[PDB]
């Protein structure tokens, strides 16, 4: 297959401004949200129809209860960081768990925490240790590392359990995730400032979002500077991007095993 990935996030805010959940937890399969839970709904609900159509109420019912418990731990863990830091007011706590199933069949896994949107603790499944960014992170690290049972459990979840779920969800939403929608690439030429020609290579209507685009002079990579456009959602499940250079030039586009050349 192509590189697909499963990940879930947690967000905890202390003293939230009216209309902001205290806790949010959202799951993704690549760029697609699959699940959602927050402290307001108090329900784990789907964010994709292929999740709704393929997962029985039993799943949603069980995971809501787990998330209700996981919500409360998050609040406690954040109160404990704030005490350690001597912080007052509103502060954020985040978690990101997930795995990647590569094209070659190999796998990656990750488990990281943040405090105030900055790296706090990063799990290393290969050694079963937590990388701490400071002394507060270090105090937590010493406590988390004291439960060896839990570290082995997470190594198994990331390595074994996560990959199975990703493969399950990938069959559930194959018509969406494994589809290919080729880009529609154009080149536009314009004399900008007196003496400066700007060439643009604009691609759109493509899925998956991952696209490679570059400018080449005589079939050799530009010695000069290329400006890059962000891969952006068009709103219809397709993406758009661009790459540009100043002034024999050609635009190159690689997307899902097909190479395109647009000579100028």
């Amino acid at each position, epitope marked *: 297959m192509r590189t697909h990935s499963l990940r879930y996030f947690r967000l905890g805010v202390s003293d939230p401004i009216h209309g902001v959940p205290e806790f949010i937890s959202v799951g993704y399969v690549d760029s697609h949200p699959i699940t959602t839970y927050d402290s307001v709904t108090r329900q784990k609900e789907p964010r994709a129809p292929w999740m709704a159509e393929n997962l029985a109420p039993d799943h949603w019912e069980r995971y809501t209860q787990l998330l209700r418990g996981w919500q409360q731990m998050f609040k406690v863990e954040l109160k404990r960081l704030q005490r350690h830091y001597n912080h007052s007011g509103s502060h954020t706590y985040q978690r990101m768990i997930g795995c990647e199933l590569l094209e070659d069949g190999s796998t990656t896994g990750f488990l990281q925490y943040a405090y105030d949107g900055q790296d706090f603790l990063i799990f290393n499944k290969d050694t079963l240790s937590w990388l701490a960014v400071d002394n507060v992170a270090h105090t937590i690290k010493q406590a988390w590392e004291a439960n060896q049972h839990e570290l082995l459990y997470q190594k198994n979840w990331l390595e074994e359990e996560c990959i*199975a779920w990703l493969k399950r969800f990938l069959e559930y939403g194959k018509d969406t995730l494994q589809r290919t929608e080729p880009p529609l690439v154009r080149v536009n030429r314009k004399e900008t400032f007196p003496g400066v020609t700007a060439l643009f290579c604009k691609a759109h209507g493509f899925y998956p979002p991952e696209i490679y685009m570059t400018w080449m002079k005589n079939g050799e990579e530009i010695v000069q500077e290329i400006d890059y456009g962000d891969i952006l959602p068009s709103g219809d499940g397709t993406y758009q991007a661009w790459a540009s250079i100043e002034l024999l030039y050609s635009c190159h586009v690689e997307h899902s095993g097909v190479h395109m050349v647009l000579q100028v």
Partner: antibody
Amino acid sequence: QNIDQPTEMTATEGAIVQINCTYQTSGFNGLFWYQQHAGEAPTFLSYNVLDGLEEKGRFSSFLSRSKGYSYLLLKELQMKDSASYLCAVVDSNYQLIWGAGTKLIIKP
Amino acid sequence: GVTQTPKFQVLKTGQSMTLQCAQDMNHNSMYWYRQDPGMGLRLIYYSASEGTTDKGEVPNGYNVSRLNKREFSLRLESAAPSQTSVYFCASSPPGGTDTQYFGEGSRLTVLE
């Protein structure tokens, strides 16, 4: 789904006994062994989630995730080891599915 | 650890009964199981955390109350002879794979 254990086992005092446990489950998040004496509460013995054999005194518990199998091995058997041994498995929905138990009888 | 009451109870068919369970281990998740000969422990109801409960495997004939962080009581509204069993209360942190700590048990007998 299914957890399977021998109903009852009998071994002689001073010997070794292996209590086998096989599971057919939707996912795997670890396997527990608990001891339960006649008319008493179950007490935790071990937790295994990665492949291998972990020793804890005269009791050692082993796991093979590929073979979906685990064993509780009891060395230098004592009359006091006479109890029910409960096998339990955490599935993909984090539900503990408990096995019916293995009554261990110790011939002195 | 986990304190459950009563150790034994006799009930007439139709009588109401409340088993009590308390724990001072700062555990979030709490469980009510029923042990019957020939089968593994069967969950009746569980409480993932203070403020939540859900039906387990065998919830018919029972209700639960998670009164606070420490207390989780099991209610038999109209006792039936099928409810003659041994009840165990259990508690663990809310990871999902955290070790369960058990109450002493509760022999309940429902007679006509």
